[PDB]
Design a protein around this ligand. Sequence first.
Ligand SMILES: [Mg+2]
Ligand SMILES: [Mg+2]
Ligand SMILES: [Mg+2]
Ligand SMILES: [Zn+2]
Ligand SMILES: [Zn+2]
Lengths: 170, 111, 1107, 14, 96, 110, 147, 220
Amino acid sequence: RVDYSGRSVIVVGPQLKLHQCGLPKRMALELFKPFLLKKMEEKGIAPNVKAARRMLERQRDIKDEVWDALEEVIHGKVVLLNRAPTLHRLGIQAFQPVLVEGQSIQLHPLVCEAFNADFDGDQMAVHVPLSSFAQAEARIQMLSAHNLLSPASGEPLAKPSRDIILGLYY
Amino acid sequence: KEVRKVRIALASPEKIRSWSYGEVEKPETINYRTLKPERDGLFDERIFGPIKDYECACGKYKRQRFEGKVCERCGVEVTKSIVRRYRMGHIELATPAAHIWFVKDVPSKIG
Amino acid sequence: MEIKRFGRIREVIPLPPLTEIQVESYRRALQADVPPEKRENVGIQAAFRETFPIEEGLVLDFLEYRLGEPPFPQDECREKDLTYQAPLYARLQLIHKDTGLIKEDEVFLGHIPLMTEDGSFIINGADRVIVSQIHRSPGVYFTPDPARPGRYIASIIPLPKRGPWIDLEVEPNGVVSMKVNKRKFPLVLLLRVLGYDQETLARELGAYGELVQGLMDESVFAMRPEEALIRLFTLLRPGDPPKRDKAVAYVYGLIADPRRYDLGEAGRYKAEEKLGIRLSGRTLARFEDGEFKDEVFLPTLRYLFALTAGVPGHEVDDIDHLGNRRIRTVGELMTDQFRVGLARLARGVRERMLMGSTPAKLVNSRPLEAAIREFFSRSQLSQFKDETNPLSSLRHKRRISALGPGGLTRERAGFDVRDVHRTHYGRICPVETPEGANIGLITSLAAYARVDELGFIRTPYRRVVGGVVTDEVVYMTATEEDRYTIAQANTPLEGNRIAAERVVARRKGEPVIVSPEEVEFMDVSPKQVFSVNTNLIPFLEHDDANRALMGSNMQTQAVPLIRAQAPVVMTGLEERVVRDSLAALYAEEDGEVAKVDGNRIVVRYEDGRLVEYPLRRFYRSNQGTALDQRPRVVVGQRVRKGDLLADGPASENGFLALGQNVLVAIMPFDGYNFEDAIVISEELLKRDFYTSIHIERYEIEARDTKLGPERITRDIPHLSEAALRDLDEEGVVRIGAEVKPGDILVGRTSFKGESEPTPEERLLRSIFGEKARDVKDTSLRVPPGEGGIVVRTVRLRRGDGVELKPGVREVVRVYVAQKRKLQVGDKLANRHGNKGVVAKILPVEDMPHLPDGTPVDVILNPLGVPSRMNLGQILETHLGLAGYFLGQRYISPIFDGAKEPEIKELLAQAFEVYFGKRKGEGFGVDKREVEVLRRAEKLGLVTPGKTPEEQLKELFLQGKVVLYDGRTGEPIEGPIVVGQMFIMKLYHMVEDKMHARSTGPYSLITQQPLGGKAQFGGQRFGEMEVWALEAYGAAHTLQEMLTLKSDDIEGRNAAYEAIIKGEDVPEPSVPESFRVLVKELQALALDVQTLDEKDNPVDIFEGLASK
Amino acid sequence: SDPVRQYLHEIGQV
Amino acid sequence: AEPGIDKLFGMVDSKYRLTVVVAKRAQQLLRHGFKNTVLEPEERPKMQTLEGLFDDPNAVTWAMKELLTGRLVFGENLVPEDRLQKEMERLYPVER
Amino acid sequence: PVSLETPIGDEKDSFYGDFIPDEHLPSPVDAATQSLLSEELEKALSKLSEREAMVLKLRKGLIDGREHTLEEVGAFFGVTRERIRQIENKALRKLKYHESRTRKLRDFLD
Amino acid sequence: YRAQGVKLHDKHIEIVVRQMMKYVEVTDPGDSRLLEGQVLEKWDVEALNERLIAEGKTPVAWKPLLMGVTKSALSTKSWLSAASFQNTTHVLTEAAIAGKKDELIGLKENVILGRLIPAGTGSDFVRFTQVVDQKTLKAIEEARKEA
Amino acid sequence: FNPLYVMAQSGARGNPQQIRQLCGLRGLMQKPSGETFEVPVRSSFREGLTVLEYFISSHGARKGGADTALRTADSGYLTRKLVDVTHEIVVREADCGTTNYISVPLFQPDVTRSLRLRKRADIEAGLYGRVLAREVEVLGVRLEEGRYLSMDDVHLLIKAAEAGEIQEVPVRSPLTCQTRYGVCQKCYGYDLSMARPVSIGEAVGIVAAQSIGEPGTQLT
DNA sequence: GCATCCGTGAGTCCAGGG
DNA sequence: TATAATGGGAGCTGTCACGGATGC
Ligand SMILES: [Mg+2]
Ligand SMILES: [Mg+2]
Ligand SMILES: [Mg+2]
Ligand SMILES: [Zn+2]
Ligand SMILES: [Zn+2]
């Protein structure tokens, strides 16, 4: 078991770009908390780290410019999404999170086949790569949009399906 | 240095005694009134180390200035309590006993 | 509104009492209503009769038992976490054999849990169900040897834990072996011990050729029964002294002691029927006049030889036939644990009979009480009651497990036990079973099925005499069913005469076309093939079984809604389900309503008596869904017996109301209903459709410490007045306050553990000159993601009819209610197995809409139908469209329901209502409707040349309409299926599942993050997640997962500090769990050494473990 | 195999 | 996709080498507060707050965009590690 | 006592011990708070002279873990116990004045 | 796989099958310390046979062996990997008697120790790579050129 | 343009047996022993089954559910075993220097009447991305030693085989690689993820194990 | 040596626990 | 610390492949 990690129900996000996922604001606040504390000190939102932490502790204490601070915290960063059972490496993929209202993770349609995910109640885990190195590995090697062909067969694995095919065919 | 290999071997009685910081002589654990560890039993700070960082069992020494000092009144080294994860003890058997792994894992290595 | 119903099968009998399998079984076990002297020797009475008398001298004997009244009623037991139970007394008498002295007393034995009216139990406050178990029946079986094709194994099987399994076999050397407790010895020996001579064995067995020769051993016949008996005791107990009375005692306890061997009544009956013999009792032999007398062994051998040779009338047994598998109900399961507790009690009695100088003095009840408690709390058939909705509870009471004590072990259960056997028909539902690894091992009783007194499942059939169907119905076991030709329930009848030349029937499961003359019985109803849940799926005949299974199972998980509705298409079972599950109050007799309240209804009955009915209001179920009853009558109303007085949860005017009827369009929608996701309208939230009430319970204790007492108080150090704003004088949050994550529900202070402050703290104190307080804040706070309105507090403090476990001074419990609106990530489903998570909530102006301006409610994707093959949901929608415009509902019974032509008639009427309204209001056909008719003509859906109206009507009779896109005003380019569908909101709410962690508690031994939302846990990055990272070559990401993020202590501390300082994370070091592994190997006498490249030790313990 | 069977035997020796 | 990812993969003999170069460079920029950047002011990656456009805080984004200019040098055994650290401290002092 | 390896539920999935948090070792949050505290105390102490900072450190035990008596700090600085008490008090007076000015140590007080 | 319409490249199966043929059995020890019937790695007996041929000695005669995937995993050289797989006590018993040194060659062994795996960015082929900007490099070259 | 037809034809949803069960007939069904029952369900799901037809359907639906259930654990177990034999195999160097190779055949024996061309997919799975171990000259095209076979190169070799110019293709393979503890870049070939030579450092054994185990649940 | 008769450890992921 | 007391109870059930160990 591991820190900086969460899970939730997944939901389709049609508007996402292939390299993006939808991450609920509250999850992102907890997943990124030390970064957010720092960034809050770096602005006037709290004198120091510990004041900021007490502020985020109570939900009715949470201000508005903290959501803006969070958005600066996640800029260009990726999270890892995982759906168990993790049968091949594409059971884990890196995504740039887009913050959303709501409590569901928003997953891009074209990665569902590789995750073997659909939307009849599946849940997924999310994880934060911390260091510059882990973050670099995740953005170069594990990004959804850099993993398009199957390593088993060489054939496309991110590819049109269901409605996408249906409309294009029509 | 840097770890490059990991060896595993039989431990001799003498090797085992070198690991041990004390023989556990009593089947006691903690005192039923004070909830503190009984002397010479399975939780004894005298053997396995202090429960509180840099503080003997009775209280005579309570700061990091004493370090490695073994208190005379209670016998407890003054170091970090984390050492209660690392310090072995031993039981000196009155008669030798076979290690069942070398008996029942067939074919028996002893046999 | 009007209910129109379809179908031509008239059910001769109603469904039986749907919980009788629970209620009657337990009533049989307790015999509480029966005067003691009239009791049968069954149930706990039979337990007593097996235990007593207790001999050796002294004797302690049983006269009778008695069950008193429960000390606390059911609600009080739920409130105070008590067990609802009755005190058990036994009248016992101690006789000293030589003195003749007799002492008699009624001794108190503890308490026995009582079954509530609905068939469940209240164990320590929580409702529980004892789930019935299925097992192989006791008896005598004959089975093919899987090794030797022409040989057979005979198996004698008693009741579970009531004797050993005995096998007889014909060995390749020809001698007939007996195996018991894994001991292969020649059966001839035991036959001799029984008193059989070679003369009797020759004359009784010689018919079967050479087989009897492998039984003839002269060295055995040359010994009298005593010498054979001692010989058997030696080859059964190596090293045990072959004492004569000890050998008698052992073999008697193995084969003849009724207190140790028991075939049961079922094993008795089946052994008798199979072997064609009569049994005196229920054991394999008796001890009569100083010698053993055979009952079963010779008949079994007779049969085994006859089967081996080939003589007619001898067949192998199908062990999965439901004549050979029986149900252990709660009464029997409990009686068995009661019998074990009583055996331990008797051992204690004999113990005190040795050491001592009264019945009470001799009897220590504790073991008995321990066994019952152990049964009702930690058994695998004792299950937390599912009462998500009332159907959930009803269904739970009718479940059947092949697991549990004395049953199968999953991961081992093969394909045979999980199959639907032909004999399941009318007995065990063929669709309702789990989808995971338990598939086929947990099942549901069929709607009309009944467990008979021996435990076999019976189903009802109507008698047919010369083509006439009578009203005699006969409940049969599968053995009896196999005798007859049984016609299908849809056989056409003119009055009572079979009006057909060719009749579909079954003979031993086999479908067969038969004349009326040949028909002996006829099914009562299609209903009898399926579980209650499966009987609630309209148009089941059009749904592939795999998705019908899902619709079945998901009705269990429907949440009760504040505006719940019954379906517009019902099967006709909805009222009976509400009734049998006690999901409503009904009038006890004819009468008149005197008083009506949110809280209570007072009715004046014909007797003149004034009966008052309190209504349960916003009570908390086991699952947190809301149990409340709402009155459905008014003052002065005249009620007949059985009329509805109040609706419970998921009840609408007495009909099962598991969700809402919503207006549905079947079309893709911009990716938002991709791969089973669902799009809904904001209108649904606006009118509180799919809104549910949920109640959470929080609990806090204040205990005595060695450091001073915990106190429940408002005076909490360092908190503002804002933090205490809604805390009462005593420090408990007030009723009606809104609590959010972080807010205090119960203030509590605890004395601090003796700590010398770190020098930094000493200096900071001096700088501010403030004494550190002596207690710290240990209050109960609302956890992350929870909250609502406080609706109850309970306060139990010691010194107040209140006594708590040792050392706790007070317990406080706070009840918090939330109204849950449908939101993105919540799960919806229909009864045909269509299920999906809400992905998008659109404002009303974005919804597809009808020409008259009516927007639809939910948008389901057509890609969910073809590969699922569950077309019932399409017919439901078609009929829903009709009902929408006619203001009517339908009952369409399964396999006997609405057909396409009748649905088309109704759609023609509904069209006239939907379109003639327009033609009257002064409007013609729209230009966009003309464009869609042009496309429809090209699709083949409408006849070219007809007028706009006639073509629109053709579409409508196909259940399709012109639909406008709310974003554009342009029509969808083809007509779309639209109609009413019944959709439920399931108890899988994202509000409960979303969870994240940065840091938090770690485990004691491993120093790894704890698991579980309540522990503020971390996610498991298991073996396979690691493989994925390895396969990407993401080496540093993985090293973080294994060190800085889990159990690298300095690493995790330093990474947190570096991040909050804006630095980069430091390099990891050794994980603690590897240190733990090294120490655990050192305890195994293994020296595990980390070396460097020069083979020199490296200390991973930094000197802290080297002297 | 069974240590108390073994011990009862050893005792039945004397 | 990361901007220019196909060219970045074109620059190395092993994809894992690009990730090592990118990560070490990102660490170097963070250590020296971005004063050692090879980007020209108009090439600096930006992030749009509410106040206005500012420097992108993400050093991996910077490092990739620098790699794409040809102005970095990568390979094995270019310089002893301590000499490199000390010269970068000299040219671009670390905050205290 | 009850066993740490008591099964929770039907499977061999989980044990009672799985749910018991380590209350002894400092959390990453607590460790970081202690570290920010030490650093802020050193920052505020550098605003005093070497002697008043050092006297405060010896008297509070921030150096060798123990708090020396006024007689020992005095014998160390070569000065009366009364003198060392007076320079401790002016050191505290200076710390309080600065802390009221910048409010840089307040939040550590809980 | 073809029967189910699954396209799977052969070389993945070949990797596994290569691990199933890892071991050989001695038929004649030659001039070696080995025993007849002893099972060892094909790589190791070939290294030994070339050491003996270079030394003018008689080489060890050996036959090829086929192991199932489970047995091949349990027979691997690294005792950390085999003991994490299955038959833990048997593996640990034989490794303890032999005093085995695990050289940390594979992935499991390094994962258990929390080490950086020898794959991907942890490969020795790439992890020592350096980066330096043109200015800093030129300045270091001036520094060198002075001495 | 019928909905069911367009979904099946386009590959969006549905196969011909499911469509047939919707519009044609449910068909033959198996007994609990697995033998097929003599009389088929003659109605489609649109027409609706009878009680008895539905009951007999149960046996096969339950067998297939129990199949699916047991096979997901068997598959995961297999994957774990495969990961344990292969985990140490990594691309460790550019070229081990072996001269050994394997020959992938383009033909297979029939009725044993003659040889016939193997199916296209089977040839692709055997040749795509592989490094040629020997010069090949077909249809006047030189495929040089050391070349990574692109998919176009594979199709070229299939054409040459149809024209008679080649029967087997010599190819570097993990079977013949001499890298200790792993594989080299030449002998492994292309990272099918990227359609180009594999990078040194790729955990090629894990990828093999996952490639083999992940479709295990589809094997019936 | 050649079979048979044994022990033994194994069985996807998550969640919560009553 | 003294009458005399002298060999125990519990089982327990629908798996499977495989390496090693006993009978032929
Ligand atoms: Mg799913
Ligand atoms: Mg399930
Ligand atoms: Mg389960
Ligand atoms: Zn001491
Ligand atoms: Zn090679």
